Amino acid sequence: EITGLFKDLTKVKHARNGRLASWDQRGKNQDYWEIPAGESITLGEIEGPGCITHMWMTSSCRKVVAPSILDPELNASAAPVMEIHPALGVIWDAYDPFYYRKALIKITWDDQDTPSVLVPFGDFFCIGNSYPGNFSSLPFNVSLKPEEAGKFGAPCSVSCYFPMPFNKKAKIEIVNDNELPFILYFNIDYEMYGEPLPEDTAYFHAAWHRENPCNGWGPELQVNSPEVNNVTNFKGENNYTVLDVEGTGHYVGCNLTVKHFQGSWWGEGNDMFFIDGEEYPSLNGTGTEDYFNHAWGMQRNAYPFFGTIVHEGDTDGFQVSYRWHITDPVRFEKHLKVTIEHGHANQLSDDWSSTAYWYQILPTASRITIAPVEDRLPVVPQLPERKLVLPQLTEEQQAARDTYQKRWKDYEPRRDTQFRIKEDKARRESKLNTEFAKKLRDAFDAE
Amino acid sequence: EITGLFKDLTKVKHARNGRLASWDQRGKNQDYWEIPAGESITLGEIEGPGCITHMWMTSSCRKVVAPSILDPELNASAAPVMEIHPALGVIWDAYDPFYYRKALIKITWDDQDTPSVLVPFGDFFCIGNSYPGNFSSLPFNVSLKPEEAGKFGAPCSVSCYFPMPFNKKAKIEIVNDNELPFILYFNIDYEMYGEPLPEDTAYFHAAWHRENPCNGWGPELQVNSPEVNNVTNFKGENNYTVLDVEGTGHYVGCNLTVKHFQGSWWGEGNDMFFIDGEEYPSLNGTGTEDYFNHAWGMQRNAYPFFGTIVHEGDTDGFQVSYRWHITDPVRFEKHLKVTIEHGHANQLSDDWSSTAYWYQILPTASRITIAPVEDRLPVVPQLPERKLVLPQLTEEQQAARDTYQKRWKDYEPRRDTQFRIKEDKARRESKLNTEFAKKLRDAFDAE
Amino acid sequence: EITGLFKDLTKVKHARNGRLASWDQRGKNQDYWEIPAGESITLGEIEGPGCITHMWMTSSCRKVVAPSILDPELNASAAPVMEIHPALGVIWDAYDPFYYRKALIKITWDDQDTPSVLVPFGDFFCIGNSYPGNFSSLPFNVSLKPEEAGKFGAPCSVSCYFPMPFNKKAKIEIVNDNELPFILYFNIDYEMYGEPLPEDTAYFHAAWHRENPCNGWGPELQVNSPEVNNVTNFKGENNYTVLDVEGTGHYVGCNLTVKHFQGSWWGEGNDMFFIDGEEYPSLNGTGTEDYFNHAWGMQRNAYPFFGTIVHEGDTDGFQVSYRWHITDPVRFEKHLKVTIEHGHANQLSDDWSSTAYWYQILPTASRITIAPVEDRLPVVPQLPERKLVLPQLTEEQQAARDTYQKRWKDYEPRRDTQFRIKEDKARRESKLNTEFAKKLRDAFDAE
Amino acid sequence: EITGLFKDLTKVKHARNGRLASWDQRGKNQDYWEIPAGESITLGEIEGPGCITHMWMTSSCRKVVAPSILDPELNASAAPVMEIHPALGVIWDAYDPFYYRKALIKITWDDQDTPSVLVPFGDFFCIGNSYPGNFSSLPFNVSLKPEEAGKFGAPCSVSCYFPMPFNKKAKIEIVNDNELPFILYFNIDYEMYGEPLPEDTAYFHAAWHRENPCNGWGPELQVNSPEVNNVTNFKGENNYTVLDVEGTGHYVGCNLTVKHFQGSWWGEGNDMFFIDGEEYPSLNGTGTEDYFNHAWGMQRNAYPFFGTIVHEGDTDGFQVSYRWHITDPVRFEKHLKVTIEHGHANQLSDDWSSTAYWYQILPTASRITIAPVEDRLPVVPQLPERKLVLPQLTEEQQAARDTYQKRWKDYEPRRDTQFRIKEDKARRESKLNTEFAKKLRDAFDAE
Ligand SMILES: OC[C@H]1O[C@@H](O)[C@@H](O)[C@@H]1O
Ligand SMILES: OC[C@H]1O[C@@H](O)[C@@H](O)[C@@H]1O
Ligand SMILES: OC[C@H]1O[C@@H](O)[C@@H](O)[C@@H]1O
Ligand SMILES: OC[C@H]1O[C@@H](O)[C@@H](O)[C@@H]1O
Ligand SMILES: [Ca+2]
Ligand SMILES: [Ca+2]
Ligand SMILES: [Ca+2]
Ligand SMILES: [Ca+2]
């Protein structure tokens, strides 16, 4: 009979599709949710048994910083994002650079008392450092326009093909720790099953970590100096920790964001895997790019199972990398610790953050935590404070300043009102999304 | 034991390879078929049980438009396509622009009364608008030389890796509705099985559709104006129809060719899927690029499961896109309607054409039809006619024109004869292909 | 329940991960082996039952050609490869151009009296002609820096995802026929199983071949001339042979390196497959790029199942191509001969070399042999020997020459000593890798 | 003493700078003129003796096609050009494609009864076919953003460094034959002399011509066919005419716009120059790209004295080329005819237009004339008429259409009012420019 990776297309399954989407439930063209500031919102709850098969999202986070001559009430029903150059003098909706780190995606399975996915919104979808890079891999993709590329908080399309099965419940939320609301478009595709999945089905988990700085013993020594290279590290007690989880499952890989400070090479450190509580690692690697299957540094390649999302050569000292263990998972019966030396023998004190992805049987024994929002922001240089003192103003210059400020006082509250109306639609459609998914489950189960 | 997408490589299967190919059955180097004008030709018939595993093709359609100083009889045995610049003045075989829409690929399973695949030759192989774009995806690939790219009817290699099981019969035909013959190279690889395929085996299906113009209510209104955006559309009675099919199976995606007329954006319309006769769509999308897993327009990306084949930014207003639902298929027990609003709430009157791909158990309940050839040609701007008046001619210029017309009246019928000869080879090898596949079937079944 | 190519991620397997790596077992930052000149070295032996799931390697081979002002003893403990421009006048470690062809990879399964893999180190990893090209495919990848690309012996990352099951034993070796040692970094991942694999399990095999020159009847005749194209070849006695193997299994593809001499096109020859001892080929192709799923020449494309690794357009007359038959394998019960005509009807006398990959049930019936190292080297044009005569020397010029000669006489032997020390580390780590793999085997089976 | 092309920087000149500019004479930031539709406007008149040394311009011509949610009265005081994507739904100011051909630049010297420069605005500044290309040469330059390039009527900066001496008067005018007004920014630099120039001083002249179609004897014969190539032409009576002028002076070159119809090569025709009424040309060229100092076609090169502005390989069949005879001028005592064969022996019937540049002693003997606006428009292919029909409209769709039509009824006249006010400023500043230029002249002469 039929073999190979396409074989399942040649047999029918009695499974019912459903979809959680930001679709405009007024039937109009606002097919996005305005996610409120400082709030969690449920994209949907799905009753199992079923499986998530595909996620697509895109997003925008703009801060109103100047009055516009665009009617704000009518503007609210036009295109949702005013991609208009500030030089035209007619509007200024600035880019919020770090909104991908200020928002989390949170997934809970089977009404467990802990989430199984708790990751910044960006990093989950392989946006490191809140700074998108255009790439394709087999389970994750980012479609980023070249004219939006190379800035913090650039808009782009994200897609996830990692399957997420659940016997009883799926609850998918966005946690917005931002002071600003943001626009989220999403299509979360699943299928519902007519019979339970095997009780030992492995469920999709993801967790985020940052060490900033890494606790390096030699940050001021040149990388690859004879003195650094002859230091020993076997047990890897101080290694950067990608994942430290208790249970039965397999790790399926990571993304890694590195901001490197000395301007040599951040990546001499070995991956070291500790399976099921062993004291010394059974799986020893050779270097950090080596783990990501590049060599002599990272290259501007993004391959199905590994590579570069954002290359250091294109940025102010930061790299985003990924490797998927899809046909080569790292398996564990009791425990897995995934580590990488942060520089050779933990020499360096760079800014490392990572998303770890794994599958495991429930219950989820490890309690997944997230650093608070103030520990999630990119490290960026800052212009020194310039204490501008106004020259002597003509009456004409003072009246321009006063007229503009009066426009700003009238305009900003009118935009605020339009934001509040859209946030109301989001909270309303959150409920509707869960209600329709319940109706779909019940109608499917009834036959 | 062995898991992951490569696992079937680790176990033998008692199945016998065969291949339908345009190989030169004289044993010489004309390993192509001259497909005759206005005729159908059978690439081959294969007795089941078996599965199509791979198709590769390439093609050329030239029109002789000028006399050549190349001996036409010897020229017939040189390379099959005279890629010689018209400025050399020695030959002119002009490119036929729309031959990809004028020819169909037609596949009938198990001696059914209706084809299960009836699609223009281009569109089946993800050439939209008879206008190749270079790209790769998991099931379909086009390899297009940059020097041939950017023109109607460019030569290129096409490859398909969608499996096509059949229990009783496969009949693969080209329907050439062109006034010209065209050169076809092909390799269709299949394997033969020793036992029947299960009765719930889903068979490969594809069908082509166009709405030109779409029935837009606001083609002259600016896209994303507040008036357009506050129109409602829940039921999608007037949505563009990608697929409307009765049976049990699953949709596995589409290509979509859009020629956009107003010069704004064509893509605001939501995908809406109607499963198993439901009145309101159960699967609600957010936008057309969103369905194709891009955002804020389409990008010049072609990923394994989605993207752009031909970008609007490179063309005279047209886009060719695809999405594959290989791990996330849209299943149906009785019926499936795959629709997309043509602009938000079907505002727009653009030229939309699509290839829908799906698998279903037999029988093919739905008679698959195709629009006639006059309805399949790309919409292109035309130069105004120029009623050129010859100047007063010198004797020398009159002699040149007469000598050239004489050369043309001798040369064209010599080229016509060489075409007719190659067409007799194609008709001969059609029969031989089916005879050999029968020998191979009988020898395999004897052992 | 769960379907599609990711499905195996949703079930746990009670299998234990292991890895053979070049990790520094002093715990320091020499995570590479200095592979000795004219020696074989075991990367590791693993006791089955198990499966290789992933290999990553990179390599460097430099010849010391000038004295350095870098302290040679300290330099041994710095970065392993001195990528320092010779115009600085401080060091010169020249690139060894053909080391990819002078070293072999050699894999023996279940203690058989033949290796099952015996292929030049480069060709195995889809580096043809000892001349890397940057590309991705589903099973094999090369990540080559653009700065390093376009030369013989360029450093690059290689990865292999073809699974390699074994019930009793895996033995992975490098055979270095080079007069120079070379640096090898490697990570070889596998999993160990608690029960045997089915005895009918198909084992990974690969073998290498070269015809230089091919035995052409008409190398001086223009390709695609009428005289060439009307020559017949049905039976393919003189076809280039990619593979000729007795057993039960399936061919999963090749790489092919062609150096072309006449400056026209090397690729008119058809693939012809002979299954189970048939006299005439049952699988006839149409041309060599056609086999590689390109058309009208090879393109600068590398797609998941086929394409170009190195494009003839970018070199001095040579191409490196691949095709993978992963979902479309060529199966055989008794025998398989994979051939391609070398030019149409074997017209041409070019330099062809290939790696064939297949799976088969044990035993390996025939010894896999390899051409000796003198027959494995790329064909490169040579500068005529420029018999330089020194002019009359000033005393200062003579003293400069003597001083330099003297530095070289002291420096070279100090670099030799440092190579011998690293070679001793490789031989020591060879034994430790096998001992650790046995400990892991025993501790796994103990549970 | 000092030599070379820089030498004149080492000697002072008792000459006064002046400048005609579109500077905002309200002292605000509208430093452009809205040139009224269907009017001429004087950029300025300058009393001699003096010399124009430098001209810079840019321009914009938008058509309001949709209602804006931008307040139009406030919008008039923001940036002058709403470079805002129509897909945002907030504004639509469409590009007018042919304004470069609908407006002329007209310069009259010494109050003569003819202009000495009468050339379409675009063509004068080496914008051919109302289609800018980015380039630099010694006397003319275009700086065109890549984002704006590849479209009719793209905004770009133009600069002219040809000197224009005048003993008595310079009058510089724009002649706007467009139905639409357009924005013009300009800076025209000159110096004023304290004594007359020698009376024999040669004055700058330019004239424009178009032959569409050219009067070809053989447009349907393949270019470079032996029949075409053996037709003779010594006297060039039917040659394309770049310049045909009576006086004493020198030709300093041309730009040439060709739209080529047969898709071979337009450029086999020789330049032939007839000096001082000779019957047979004394200067015989070899081909059209040869005249332009390219070969085997035109290249994407733009060099100080010659090259390509717009390359045929980037357009729908049209090329724009230039040559400057700055050190190699073509001198005449009584008469010059500059001709080029329109294809070999005037075979072809393509669309040729040119700007000829020359210097000559006054008087300008013959009126410089120009084809009327309807004879100046690029030849472009036209889409067939779409004859859309509205479907049956919902009450909602009808209400949206009525609301949008009402917004447009109100909005368009509001934009018309703002254009009329800016046109009043242009007419006002025309007078002020000439008044100020007279005050400068008188103040300088007083000194
Ligand atoms: O890729 C080989 C080695 O080169 C260096 O960049 C190290 O990080 C690595 O282990
Ligand atoms: O990608 C987000 C949204 O942007 C617009 O171009 C819409 O087509 C889409 O719904
Ligand atoms: O790809 C079509 C044909 O063109 C030539 O390059 C041949 O090698 C091939 O069979
Ligand atoms: O450049 C040499 C010759 O090549 C052809 O394109 C002719 O137009 C020209 O005279
Ligand atoms: Ca290391
Ligand atoms: Ca929408
Ligand atoms: Ca052939
Ligand atoms: Ca000529």
Author numbering:
A (entry chain F), B (entry chain E), C (entry chain D), D (entry chain A): 3 to 449
Wording from the paper:
These results indicate that αFFase1 specifically catalyzes the reversible hydrolysis of the intramolecular α-(2→1′)-D-fructofuranosidic bond of DFA I and DHL II. Because of the significant bias of equilibrium toward DFA synthesis, we propose a common name difructose dianhydride I synthase/hydrolase for this enzyme (EC 3.2.1.134). Each monomer consists of β-jelly roll 1 (residues 3–200, green), β-jelly roll 2 (201–396, magenta), and a 51-amino acid–long α-helix at the C terminus (397–448, blue), englobing the whole structure.
The structures of αFFase1 complexed with D-fructose and D-arabinose were determined at a resolution of 1.76 and 1.87 Å, respectively. In the active sites of all six chains, β-Fruf and β-Araf were observed in similar conformations at the expected −1 subsite. The sugar ligands are surrounded by Trp267, Glu270, Glu291, Asp292, Trp298, and Tyr187′ (prime indicates that this residue is from the neighboring protomer). Notably, Glu291 and Glu270 are positioned close to the anomeric C2 atom from the β and α configuration sides, respectively. The Ca2+ is coordinated by the side chains of Asn31′, Asp33′, and Asn272, the main chain carbonyl of Glu270 and Thr288, and two water molecules. One of the two coordinating water molecules forms a hydrogen bond with the C4 hydroxy group of Fruf (C3 hydroxy of Araf).
